[PDB]
Write a protein that binds this DNA or RNA. Sequence first.
DNA 1: GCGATCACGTA
DNA 2: GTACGTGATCGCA
Length: 580
Amino acid sequence: AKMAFTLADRVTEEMLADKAALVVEVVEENYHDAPIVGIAVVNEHGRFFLRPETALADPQFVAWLGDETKKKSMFDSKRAAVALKWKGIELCGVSFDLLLAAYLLDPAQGVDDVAAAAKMKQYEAVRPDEAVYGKGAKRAVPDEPVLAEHLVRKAAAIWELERPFLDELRRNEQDRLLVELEQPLSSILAEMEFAGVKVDTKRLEQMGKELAEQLGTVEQRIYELAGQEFNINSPKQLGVILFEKLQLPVLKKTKTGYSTSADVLEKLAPYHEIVENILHYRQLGKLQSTYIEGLLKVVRPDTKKVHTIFNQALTQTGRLSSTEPNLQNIPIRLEEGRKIRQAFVPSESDWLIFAADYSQIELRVLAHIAEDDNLMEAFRRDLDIHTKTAMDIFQVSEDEVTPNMRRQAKAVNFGIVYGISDYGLAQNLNISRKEAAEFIERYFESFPGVKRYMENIVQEAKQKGYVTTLLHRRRYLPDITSRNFNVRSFAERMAMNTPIQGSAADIIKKAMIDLNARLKEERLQAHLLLQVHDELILEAPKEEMERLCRLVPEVMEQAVTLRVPLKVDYHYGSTWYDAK
DNA sequence: GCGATCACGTA
DNA sequence: GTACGTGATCGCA
Ligand SMILES: OC[C@H]1O[C@@](CO)(O[C@H]2O[C@H](CO)[C@@H](O)[C@H](O)[C@H]2O)[C@@H](O)[C@@H]1O
Ligand SMILES: OC[C@H]1O[C@@](CO)(O[C@H]2O[C@H](CO)[C@@H](O)[C@H](O)[C@H]2O)[C@@H](O)[C@@H]1O
Ligand SMILES: [Mg+2]
């Protein structure tokens, strides 16, 4: 049942039609400066397989690749685009990306290869990449006959599937979402990943030595307090010391033993001095292993830059994820960890890091979607939302709001966005269900619009089978009808949260597209480096800071128009840490 | 070599 | 109670 195709030894005119399914295969998971093992082109004239050495050296082919008028349909065009950027070749004219199309149609499918997307439309004349390349150690590029066959079948699948996918996207009112949001963003993410972020490796290594020193001290202190040595990083060995040798109370159990999570340890601190030391060890050890050593392992030795890969088709809510390294979870909450950011520096001398972040975008989005009068007014007055919530749920004036009252109102606001639950709020604020329930009840009394939204959105998820975001992203919630309380409740929380987190994702994605257009129009050298859900990190000549101070916030604030204003704070400095 | 567990970093 | 990714340990191949 082999598929017919030409194993070309040279590029020909018919291979450069103005519309084609293109496969520029990069097998290495991390495509940065990675090899392109083969190329397949399927168009009106037939199916072709070209060896990369040949194709990429052919002037006509490279010109075809960069010609925006020559339209290409692909799967994960960003992967190809970045791999090509590393070879100094521009990819343009990608009008359809099956990966992104599949992702928008149903994020839950976990589509990560052409075969998975094709299976959505009962097309199975293509093999899963894992079947062809294997995984782990067994992973390898098969001989040309097998490789060529696979790439051609993928291009053929893309060629056949474009119409049906676009048709369904259109029915879902997601056609613009793909064409005007995700696909253009893909090119922006490609530029960001390729540009990378410069790392001050000397600073990291210095912090590592200081940490190693402190860690040794705390480590020895722990052995001294426990009366023996053991693997502190072993929750099993640690559990024996804590709950057996030291007789500390067992307040929380895990699935396979005693729990030793930070939340549990905090409660045990009053009983033994060893606890605070374990907590300190946990903090320093996390920085050392994950942010000092982990980061140093992925820094390109030549450029000293880290090139993350933003997975644009993974999260169930529309957010991006970041890997190798993850640049969306660099420490900031605790000062010791926050200093890690001093290692992220501008890529050129006399340039600076500029960071802009939305202030409470999720709650502003909630105010908009729920049309809660009280909540919308609060933002229209740009009030401290946590103090305002405390004032309302505890019924007091601003001056009567104590720090603990704001702390709890803050916790309530988080729960509301995540899918409020008396049990959940209880565990978080360490109080009884009855108490937590009363807080939630008080919240809804003050924000009836939000209560109505939470009730209505769950009902809608059940009626339609899914929930949507501001820009029409969708997430199916089949569990919304489960007769199992736990399974159903999780789906209900997703119904409440997805439109919020998802709409916030839509907004910043459009902001990125709008920003890049503005930067180009102004011919600024400034460029995006990272996106961390509700913030954009750029770098630019120190001479562009004043213009960026006005331009970036405005573009982000004007990405979409809501019933409440969007507010963006911004800072800049010599390092990411200093952009505060 | 792999993957389940537990842990913890972010918004 | 939302959404993620990475690393140390550990027991089975
Ligand atoms: O290229 C990113 C794109 O590829 C997928 C598979 O189609 O993920 C692959 O590449 C990621 C980046 O290296 C890895 O984290 C992942 O494990 C690997 O399968 C998509 O999920 C993603 O959108
Ligand atoms: O008591 C109604 C109240 O319960 C929630 C869960 O907190 O939903 C339950 O009741 C609905 C009927 O009104 C069902 O459709 C739903 O499946 C069930 O879990 C809230 O959404 C609702 O306001
Ligand atoms: Mg913020």
